[PDB]
Amino acid sequence: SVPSQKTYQGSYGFRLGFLHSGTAKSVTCTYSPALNKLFCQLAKTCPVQLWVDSTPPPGTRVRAMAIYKQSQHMTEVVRRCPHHERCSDSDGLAPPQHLIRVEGNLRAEYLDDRNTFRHSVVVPCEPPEVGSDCTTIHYNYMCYSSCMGGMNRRPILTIITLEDSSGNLLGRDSFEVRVCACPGRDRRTEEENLRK
Numbered sequence: 001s002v003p004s005q006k007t008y009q010g011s012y013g014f015r016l017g018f019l020h021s022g023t024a025k026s027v028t029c030t031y032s033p034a035l036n037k038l039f040c041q042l043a044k045t046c047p048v049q050l051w052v053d054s055t056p057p058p059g060t061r062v063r064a065m066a067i068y069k070q071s072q073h074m075t076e077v078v079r080r081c082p083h084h085e086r087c088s089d090s091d092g093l094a095p096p097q098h099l100i101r102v103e104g105n106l107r108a109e110y111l112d113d114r115n116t117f118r119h120s121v122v123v124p125c126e127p128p129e130v131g132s133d134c135t136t137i138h139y140n141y142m143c144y145s146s147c148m149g150g151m152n153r154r155p156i157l158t159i160i161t162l163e164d165s166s167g168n169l170l171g172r173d174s175f176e177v178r179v180c181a182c183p184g185r186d187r188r189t190e191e192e193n194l195r196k
């Protein structure tokens with residue numbers, strides 16, 4: 001099977017937001033609206049904003065999962081490559097096989113689906129800090145898109161789902177991800193390719 005990637009704002013008007021980080025060679029994470037694609041360095045902080053029009057119930061959660069973008073690979077579980085799953089860089093909570101981690105949230109839970117074997121990481125949905133207009137989750141991607149025997153240059157999507165306390169769908173958004181050495185350069189290149 002294959003998880004849905006259909007954008008769905010749902011009853012609470014759920015959607016993502018991204019910072020405007022630019023494309024300098026020194027940037028570590030940058031988002032392209034034209035490509036709906038996040039470019040980031042290995043294991044660096046990726047801020048993702050969560051926006052709603054109305055307050056979801058207590059117990060609402062936010063889940064992140066990666067799938068391959070190309071149809072011929074969508075049934076393959078996205079996981080870390082044979083090197084990175086053994087490099088002993090765990091944070092104490094994320095299983096070493098998981099591509100996506102949440103940084104700095106002790107309530108993050110990591111799921112290995114008993115049926116699909118797919119990995120995901122889920123956190124409680126929290127209201128914005130006083131003075132802020134949205135909530136931000138900090139994600140890390142723990143393999144390069146190019147890693148041999150893992151993603152192996154295949155593009156991936158991250159699916160973010162807003163869930164009730166049972167895991168039922170309340171909202172869904174998604175974005176493509178490239179984990180690479182030079183996100184600013186690669187964003188500029190792919191945006192130019194798109195224009196051309």
Ligand SMILES: CCn1c2ccc(C[NH2+]C)cc2c2ccc(Br)cc21
Nearest residue numbers: 050051052055125126127133134135
């Ligand atoms: C999904 C995170 N998020 C928000 C994001 C934006 C806004 C609107 N601010 C102007 C309100 C909320 C909000 C309110 C309650 C809870 Br629980 C989570 C919330």
Ligand SMILES: [Zn+2]
Nearest residue numbers: 081084143147
């Ligand atoms: Zn790797």
